[PDB]
């Protein structure tokens, strides 16, 4: 996921 985005920012993971």
């Amino acid at each position, epitope marked *: 996921g*985005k920012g993971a």
Partner: antibody
Amino acid sequence: EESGGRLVTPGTPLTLTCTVSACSLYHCTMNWVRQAPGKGLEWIGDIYTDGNTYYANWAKGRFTISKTSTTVDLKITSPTTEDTATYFCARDSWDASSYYGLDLWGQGTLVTVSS
Amino acid sequence: AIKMTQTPSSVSAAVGGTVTINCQASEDIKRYLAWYQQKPGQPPKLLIYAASKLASGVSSRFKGSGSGTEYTLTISGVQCDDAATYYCQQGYTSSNVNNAFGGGTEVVVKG
């Protein structure tokens, strides 16, 4: 032969074709952005590589974004005089930590909705 | 809804000076943030991606910084070629967005 502008009478649907090719990468969207006279950039929506489309809340129900082969369209479903604007398409990309931005932009189309 | 807020609305800088313009997000966008330069009659040009990285061919006079909700763009050694309107944009989500772009900051260069 592309003029760079359009004249559409209110209520007649207008379809714009993006000159940037569709996403090759999975984490990539094609986007449509308007700029009304004297105003800032207003994101309209995007289309994902799984086919899903998103619209800015004001834009919900006023546009449809679609893909045909490797070409992305924007359909203004019932134009009003408030849709007079320059329209751009733009492509972005990202991974799990970096947003790579809208790196590729098409040229603007100068749309006027008028009777 | 993630609101993007740019301040100031307009700023002036002498040639050779330094300006800093700000971009605030209403929620943490995890540095999924891009900056653009637009001159009249042109499409916007990507300047900075992932909050702090120089897009292809962009002058290193441009510096992006920040994290969480607060981001900045700094132009060092301002040149007349930098006169433009600058926009920030969140690339964190496409859902429940009123505008992904901030409202823009006009940069006037004093020659």
